[PDB]
Amino acid sequence: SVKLTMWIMPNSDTPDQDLLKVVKPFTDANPHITVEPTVVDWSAALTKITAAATSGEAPDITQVGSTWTAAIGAMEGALVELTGKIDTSAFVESTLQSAYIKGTDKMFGMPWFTETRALFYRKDACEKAGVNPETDFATWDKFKDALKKLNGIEVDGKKLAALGMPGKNDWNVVHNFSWWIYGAGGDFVNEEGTQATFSSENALKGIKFYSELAVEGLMDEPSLEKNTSDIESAFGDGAYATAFMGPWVISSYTKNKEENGNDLIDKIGVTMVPEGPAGRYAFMGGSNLVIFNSSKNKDEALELLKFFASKEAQVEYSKVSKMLPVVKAAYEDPYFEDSLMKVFKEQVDKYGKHYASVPGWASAEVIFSEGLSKIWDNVMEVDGAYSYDKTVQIVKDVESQINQILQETS
């Protein structure tokens, strides 16, 4: 018999058991294959995977952050090339980009699940404030006008901040700026993926618009010291009129109502991110699966990957992980078509934009995160008055470092 070993990151409440429940139909139907998952923490995962690819001491399969696929796939002899082995027509088209090395036709990962961030809002706050969510969040300028009407609005005796979002003490620093940069007509790197474009006029327009929401008082100031999970919890206890969050919060708030009677879930809606001057783009994240070239059972490894891309496994794993499926047929399930979830379905499909899938991306993201962290410090005036010129200098200094990374990894 064949024991497939698989590394996963912590995607659900009980990672190993939840994965094994989803694969039980596969191992029941293929009794000569067993699946042995091992959990690897997110912070050290890329380090451990890179070391396994280099040393040939690897599991058969590992989850990767979708942005890591090119980094690992570019390592000589690291991964099984999947080009032509997966039916790509099954996948939401926007999710496939991260599975390839950009500029090549080489597919080294299979998309597994995805996520995007949407704009959640308090319906009761909007009615009280005179905000119509069917129109007033559609564009940057309308959104900001709505925030002005919502900031400090009192609902059931509690004063709400207009927008709750984390600052630099967080793991989504870059991801939360991404769609502002895109909507302004900017990007982190050029289309070819070979030059940084983070200091363009358009990128700065997006960075300035989003970060100065803090200078203008429209963001909850205490929350800028906190992280994503804190903003999700606080919104779920009614602290903010709006917040940009992933789809997993719907389950959390639904559970809060079932267990504690917390009716926040009945007072919220969700809409797509506001369109910027250049159009509507949204963040895309998530994870892919890869097969190590050192695997002694690649045929069985591939069969497992294809199982994870089957409709039933996509539905079931997305439910338990609270992520979004990457296969089109999974969105036929009513779960992904309810009033809130359907906004996420539409956004990832029609407007999702993934970071360039280049081998240097993972290294570049750390640099972008450091720079945007300094921009938060700047707008929050932690060390002197806010200076937009300081943001410009930070972004130019980032641009230089990114170009050196791209030159090394070309």
Which amino acid, one-letter code, is at 93? E
> For residue 397, with 0-12 CB atoms within 10 Å meaning exposed, 13-18 middle and 19 or more buried, which class applies?
middle
Residues sharing a CB contact under 8 Å with residue 131, sequence separation 6 or more, in sequence order: 125, 146, 149, 150
Q: Looking at the structure, tell me whether residues 108 and 121 fall in a common domain.
A: no
| Angle value at C-alpha 349, between 90 and 67, nearest 5 degrees | 85
What technique was this entry resolved by?
X-ray
Scan for tokens 């809060």, then name that residue: 256
Cα separation, 403 vs 5, in Å, equals 37
CB 240 within 8 A of CB 234: yes
**Total domain count for the chain?**
2
Same-domain status, 96 and 142: no
Please give the backbone phi and psi of residue 81, each rounded to the nearest 5 degrees, phi first: -70, 125
State the DSSP code for 11: -
Same domain, 169 and 71: no
Tell me, yes or no, whether 103 and 124 share the same domain: no
| H or E stretch covering 122 | strand 118-122
Q: What are the distances in angstroms from CA 8 to CA 18, 166, 307, 398?
A: 11, 27, 16, 32
CA torsion through residues 43, 62, 367, 349, sign: negative
For residue 64, report the phi and psi dihedrals to the nearest 5 degrees: -130, 145
Phi-psi domain of 185 (left: phi exceeds 0; alpha: psi -120 through 50; beta: other) = left
Cα separation, 308 vs 353, whole angstroms: 23
The candidate with the shortest Cα–Cα distance to 347, out of 117, 122, 98, 90, is 117
Residue type, 3: K
My answer on whether 243 and 351 are in the same domain is: no
Residues 267 and 402 placed together within one structural domain of the fold:
yes
Q: Cα(375)–Cα(381) distance, rounded to whole angstroms?
A: 10
Nearest of 363, 298, 324 to residue 92 by alpha carbon: 324
Q: Specify whether the CB–CB gap between 206 and 140 falls below 8 A.
A: no
Same domain, 130 and 242: yes
Same-domain check for residues 337 and 372:
no
Residues 235 and 124 in one domain: yes
Instruction: Please give the single-letter amino acid code of residue 172.
Output: N
Query: 266 with 311, same domain?
Result: no
Question: Residue 124 is encoded by which pair of tokens?
Answer: 């009761």
Tokens coding 145: 């006008």
In terms of domains, do 130 and 209 share one?
A: yes
Place of tokens 């027509």: 89
Helix (H) or strand (E) holding 286, with range, is strand 285-291
Residue 65 and residue 201: Cα distance in Å, rounded? 30
Residues 289 and 107: beta-carbon distance below 8 Å: no
Q: What six digits make up the tokens of 166?
A: 């984390």
Residue 204 neighbours by CB distance under 10 Å: 19
Q: Which residues, in sequence order, are CB contacts of 87 under 8 Å at separation 6+?
A: none
Q: What are phi and psi of 60, to 5 degrees?
A: -70, -40
Give one word for 77, left, alpha or beta, with left for phi > 0 and alpha for psi -120 to 50. left
3-state secondary structure of 75: coil
Q: Are residues 167 and 78 in the same domain?
A: no
**β-bridge pairing 352-353 and 282-283:** parallel
Domain that residue 396 falls in: 117-282+358-410
Give this entry's resolution in angstroms: 1.7
Neighbours of 134 (CB within 10 A): 10
Strand partners, 268: 122
CA distance 290 to 102: 17
Compute the half-sphere exposure of residue 340: CA atoms within 13 Å on the CB side of its CA: 20
